[PDB]
Amino acid sequence: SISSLGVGSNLPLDQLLTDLTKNEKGRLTPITKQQSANSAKLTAYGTLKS
Amino acid sequence: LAEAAATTTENPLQKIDAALAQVDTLRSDLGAVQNRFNSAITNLGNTVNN
Secondary structure (H helix, E strand, O other): OOOOOOOOOOOOHHHHHHHHHHHHHHHHHHHHHHHHHHHHHHHHHHHHHO | OOOOOOOOOOOHHHHHHHHHHHHHHHHHHHHHHHHHHHHHHHHHHHHHHO
C-alpha cells in the first residue's frame, strides 16, 4: 500500500522507476494509432449513411 | 495535331463508354496500390518498434 522506496537507499529510486514505466508504456502507442484511424473510418461511414 | 473531322462520328457512345472503362480500371489499380502501401507502412512501424 505505502509503496515506499529508497527508504534506506537515499538514491532517487522513485522517479527513476516512474521514468521506467513511462518508457515502457512507450511500446503501446502504435496500437493506439491503428485504433484511432479505424474508429475515424467508422464514424465517417456513419456520416455517409446519414 | 487534332484533325478536323470531315464527317459525323458513328456510335460515339461506345467510344465514350470505352474511355470511362479505361478510367475505372486505372482507378481500381491505384486504389489497390494505395492499400498495399498503407499496409506496408503499418508493417514497417511495427518492425521498427520491435
